[PDB]
Amino acid sequence: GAPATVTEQGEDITSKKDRGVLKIVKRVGNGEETPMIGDKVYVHYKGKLSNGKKFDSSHDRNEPFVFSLGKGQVIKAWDIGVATMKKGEIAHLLIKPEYAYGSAGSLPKIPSNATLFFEIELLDFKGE
Numbered sequence: 001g002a003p004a005t006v007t008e009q010g011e012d013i014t015s016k017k018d019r020g021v022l023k024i025v026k027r028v029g030n031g032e033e034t035p036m037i038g039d040k041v042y043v044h045y046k047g048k049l050s051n052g053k054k055f056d057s058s059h060d061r062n063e064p065f066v067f068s069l070g071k072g073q074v075i076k077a078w079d080i081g082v083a084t085m086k087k088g089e090i091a092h093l094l095i096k097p098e099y100a101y102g103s104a105g106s107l108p109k110i111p112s113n114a115t116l117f118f119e120i121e122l123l124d125f126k127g128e
């Protein structure tokens with residue numbers, strides 16, 4: 001399924017080329033612009049532990065998930081991954097623990113050393 005496809009086909013978007021954040025594009029976005037650090041971004045998403053024991057969506061609230069890039073609002077993998085996305089893009093990300101919750105984990109949802117999978121749709125972004 002989607003997580004195994006990212007492992008086999010995903011691009012390594014990390015600087016260190018350690019396969020910590022792997023990406024595939026499921027839908028090409030519009031234009032060329034991608035968001036800057038400090039930009040307010042609006043997404044829909046679905047996330048899961050790569051073994052599927054826990055799941056989370058924005059579609060629960062039926063409202064965008066809003067966060068600002070580079071402000072420490074989200075796991076490091078989201079700052080890296082969303083920064084690469086165009087408006088309208090849908091991407092899949094597979095994330096190693098070093099770019100998410102690490103050895104500490106985050107009880108009760110996230111065990112130590114957890115690989116995460118996300119689908120993210122970048123709806124819009126705006127300047128601070």
Ligand SMILES: COc1ccc(CC[C@H]2OC(=O)[C@@H]3CCCCN3C(=O)[C@@H](C3CCCCC3)c3cc(OC)c(OC)c(c3)OC[C@@H](O)[C@H](O)COc3cccc2c3)cc1OC
Pocket residue numbers: 045047048049054055056072073074075076078100101106109110116
């Ligand atoms: C700067 O570093 C951080 C900043 C913030 C956080 C808090 C967690 C933060 O969630 C995330 O960063 C990612 C990406 C954005 C969407 C939510 N994320 C999750 O990891 C999900 C996971 C995904 C796999 C399946 C289980 C849920 C998430 C993790 C949560 O805690 C660890 C969590 O509880 C807070 C959560 C949703 O709740 C969703 C919703 O019920 C809350 O109302 C809003 O949650 C967040 C809101 C903002 C940021 C994050 C969570 C952690 C950070 O580093 C460890």
